[PDB]
Structure 1
Amino acid sequence: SMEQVAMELRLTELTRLLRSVLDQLQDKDPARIFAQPVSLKEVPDYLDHIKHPMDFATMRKRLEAQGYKNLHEFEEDFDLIIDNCMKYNARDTVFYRAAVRLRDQGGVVLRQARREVDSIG
């Protein structure tokens, strides 16, 4: 149907906008601490601690399959990255501190993204 196509164009354009959001958030992680999945070879107990691992490569795979229906879903995954790190790692660690800085800096990007998603519809 023509409606299915219109819906699909909306999803494509959301995907375009979320790709630019993802790029901007990942620039706030210049150490690449959150770029890839925590390695279960190197942290073999990880899944005992963290039930839903997340990272920027995994988000990018979902994004490119158009697997985010709305901004809320995308934000859910970003918050997992931060929240998983802040639980697994102690306050005094470069990992925790990186997550805090990513959260604080990302807030700005995500605030305007929400306005754009609502605005353009």
Structure 2
Amino acid sequence: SMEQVAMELRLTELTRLLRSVLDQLQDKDPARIFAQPVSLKEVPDYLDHIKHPMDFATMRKRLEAQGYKNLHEFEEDFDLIIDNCMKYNARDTVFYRAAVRLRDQGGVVLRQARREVDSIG
């Protein structure tokens, strides 16, 4: 149907916007601490601690399959990155501190993304 096509164009355009958001958030992680999944070879107990691991590569795979229906779903995955790190790692670690900085800097980006998603529809 033509309606299904229109919905698909909307999803495509959301995906374009989320790709730009993802690029901007990932620039706030210049150390690449959140770039890839935590390695279960290197941290074998991880899944005993963290039940829903997340990282920017995994988000990018979902994004490119157009698997984010709305901004809330995308933000859920970004918050997992941060929140997982802040639980597994202690306050005095470079990992925790990187997550705080990513949260703080990403907030700005996400605030305007929400306005754009609402504005453009």
Query: What's the TM-score, normalizing by structure 1?
Result: 1.00
Q: Which runs of 5+ in 1 are unaligned?
A: none
- 2-side partners of 1:49 and 1:73: how far apart? 23
- 2-side partners of 1:115 and 1:98: how far apart? 26
SS of 2:59's partner is: helix
- 1-side partners of 2:25 and 2:56: how far apart? 9
> 1:117 — aligned with what?
117
Percent identity for Structure 1 against Structure 2: 100
- 1:88-112 Cα deviation digits (max 9, x unpaired): 0000000000000000000000000
Aligned residue pair count: 121
- 1:52-74 Cα deviation digits (max 9, x unpaired): 00000000000000000000000
Query: How many Å apart are 1:23 and its aligned residue?
Result: 0.0
SS of 1:37's partner is: coil
- 2-side partners of 1:48 and 1:84: how far apart? 12
Query: How many Å apart are 1:83 and its aligned residue?
Result: 0.0
Query: What's the TM-score, normalizing by structure 2?
Result: 1.00
Query: How many Å apart are 1:18 and its aligned residue?
Result: 0.0
Q: Which runs of 5+ in 2 are unaligned?
A: none
Query: How many Å apart are 1:87 and its aligned residue?
Result: 0.0
How is 1:21-100 mapped onto 2 (pairs within 5 angstroms)?
Answer: 21-100=21-100
- 2-side partners of 1:2 and 1:14: how far apart? 19
> 2:6 — aligned with what?
6
Query: How many Å apart are 1:20 and its aligned residue?
Result: 0.0
- 1:16-74 Cα deviation digits (max 9, x unpaired): 00000000000000000000000000000000000000000000000000000000000
SS of 1:107's partner is: helix
